[PDB]
Amino acid sequence: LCVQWKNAYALCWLDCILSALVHSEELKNTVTEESIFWRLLTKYNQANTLFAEIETCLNEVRDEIFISLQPQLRCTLGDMESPVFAFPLLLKLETHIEKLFLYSFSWDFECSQCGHQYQNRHMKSLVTFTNVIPEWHPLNAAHFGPCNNCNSKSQIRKMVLEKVSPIFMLHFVEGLPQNDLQHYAFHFEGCLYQITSVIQYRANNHFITWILDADGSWLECDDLKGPCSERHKKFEVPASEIHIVIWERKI
Amino acid sequence: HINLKVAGQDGSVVQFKIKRHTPLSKLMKAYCERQGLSMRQIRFRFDGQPINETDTPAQLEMEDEDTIDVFQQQTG
Ligand SMILES: [Ca+2]
Ligand SMILES: [Cl-]
Ligand SMILES: [Zn+2]
């Protein structure tokens, strides 16, 4: 049973990211060196090997990370915030770490009312989906959207993957259509991608991280639940509360 | 008088012309009025950072044809 941060100064939007990072195998392999991510994983493991002593070791690196985010994120300690904004700003602090998350794709659009169509290539570490089609899948990553040319609604815009990084993350404003995570596994150009962690958005004001452990069980990292975590036999968050989904390439 | 694009996560894009030193509050409020959104319910982002109504394009070093990201407010 792994250790986790305790809630303080409304930092759940940051704790949820920190739990996801320390349980990423690809990240742990890359970091293992005066990196803030090396300091994060070293302090976490130093705390995980051992309650107040654990909290102090975890709070120091959390404070250091928060202060690094503060100029970009423009927040004051105790402010509420979103991991959608915070997660990529954290990654951009070190290009060698950010490269693990940067995937290339293209937004493909074609209006059925008028002829308007485009296909725009982008490169992001975290893309947002809203009003996804019921059949939404990483290999069929489509959502309903308006047309900028004729204002027709319920047209479809589709993400066409072009180059997927070792870590692949997506944000869903209204969650996923369903919560059986095995159906969202996918291969892309020969490599398997499985959901290894999920950030849950509970009550529209609180974030909790879920971690897939080796035995197929799950670990809930709710910072309200103290330093320890909670083991669940299987995944449990309601589909509409699935906020950030983290795919990781399987080696 | 730079041109800015306000891109929502649904794929919508609204073009705006704005002077470099006028605060973005007029842009934000007009975008909300056009899309039927509430200022309290959305967030604006440029180059990864949230932007206030007191911010100006010159303060954020915006260029012509730059893009502002609009998000449904989802904090915690
Ligand atoms: Ca893992
Ligand atoms: Cl794992
Ligand atoms: Zn159209």
Side-chain angles (χ1 to χ4, degrees), chain B residues 18 20-25 27-56:
Chain B
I18 197 182
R20 291 217 199 241
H21 297 289
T22 73
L24 297 167
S25 182
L27 179 138
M28 295 178 187
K29 285 173 101 211
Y31 179 80
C32 285
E33 198 59 61
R34 186 154 156 101
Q35 312 300 97
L37 305 159
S38 166
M39 275 289 290
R40 301 184 57 99
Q41 285 276 279
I42 67 171
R43 294 183 85 193
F44 297 80
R45 207 184 54 186
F46 171 75
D47 203 64
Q49 322 189 322
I51 56 190
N52 316 108
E53 319 170 38
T54 73
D55 291 346
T56 78

Side-chain angles (χ1 to χ4, degrees), chain A residues 10 12-13 72-74 80-82 84-85 89 128 130 143 145-146 148 157 171 173 201 204-207 243, chain B residues 8-14 34 43-45 47-52 55 60 69 71-76:
Chain A
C12 71
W13 55 267
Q72 316 180 8
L73 197 58
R74 297 172 84 181
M80 282 186 168
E81 193 43 78
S82 69
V84 178
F85 282 47
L89 295 177
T128 291
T130 180
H143 70 85
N148 296 318
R157 199 182 57 145
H171 161 238
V173 177
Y201 192 29
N204 288 315
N205 59 29
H206 179 49
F207 305 98
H243 198 237
Chain B
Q9 307 315 295
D10 61 345
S12 62
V13 175
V14 183
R34 186 154 156 101
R43 294 183 85 193
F44 297 80
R45 207 184 54 186
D47 203 64
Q49 322 189 322
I51 56 190
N52 316 108
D55 291 346
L60 307 153
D69 289 345
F71 291 92
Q72 179 186 304
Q73 177 142 339
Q74 274 180 330
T75 57

